Amino acid sequence: GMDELELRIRKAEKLVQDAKKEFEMGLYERCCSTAYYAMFHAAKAMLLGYGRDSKTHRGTIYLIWECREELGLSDDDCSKLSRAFDLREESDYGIYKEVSKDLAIKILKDAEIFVQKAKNAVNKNR
Amino acid sequence: GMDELELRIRKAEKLVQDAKKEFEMGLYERCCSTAYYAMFHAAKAMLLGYGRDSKTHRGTIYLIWECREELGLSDDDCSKLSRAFDLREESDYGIYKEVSKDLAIKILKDAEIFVQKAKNAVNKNR
Numbered sequence A, B: 001g002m003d004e005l006e007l008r009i010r011k012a013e014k015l016v017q018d019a020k021k022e023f024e025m026g027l028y029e030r031c032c033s034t035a036y037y038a039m040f041h042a043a044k045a046m047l048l049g050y051g052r053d054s055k056t057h058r059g060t061i062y063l064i065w066e067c068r069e070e071l072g073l074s075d076d077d078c079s080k081l082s083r084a085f086d087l088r089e090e091s092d093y094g095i096y097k098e099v100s101k102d103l104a105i106k107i108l109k110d111a112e113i114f115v116q117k118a119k120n121a122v123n124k125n126r
Helices: A004-024 A028-049 A057-066 A075-093 A101-121 B004-024 B028-049 B057-066 B075-093 B101-121
Strands: none
Touching (some): A004 A028, A004 A101, A004 B028, A028 A101, A028 B004, A028 B028, A057 A075, A075 A101, B004 B028, B004 B101, B028 B057, B028 B075, B057 B075, B075 B101
């Protein structure tokens, strides 16, 4: 449908594909930022489906942590989101460090895992 | 040098090129988001060079408006930034609307103009 849960998961899925394409073009910073966004929407979908809500990146990340058991997320899964956020902050707002191919691939693979787990949690792996 | 003014302008310039490549791959939402980031860093460079500072997107946008005369920016130039921010919000955080090729090209061309004007203002068109 056109409900928020469906559209969030669809947005997360599209962003994962966009990030894959950025990676192949060698746009490693852009890949990291997009991959974080995919995870953000997936997190928001999980919070929606389980009657929680957030209005900030940090708020969203901590709620995911708090609700991990119910959501079927491991501690590593929750760390995937924290780390992707921190790396997105560097990609979008940092001016000294450049992001390597190897960092970007790490975040991309984390996004794939995190978004799949989100789909599982909200019964959208359908 | 490795000073903030130089690195901000360099970041803005790189982001404009990244956005051009996203556009060519057909990643229209990603293009808009990247183009806004280019303009953001260019705005921060102009504020730095003219002894002002900001800590929010909206704060940055309003300071650019306030300082436009001194910066050599037209009202349209300031509207380029406001609109690019609003469209970046839709590209990154919206879940209903998709961004067309024609919107993305508009924002891309605005970023090119805005970043050049920023370079002029801070004497980095060198």
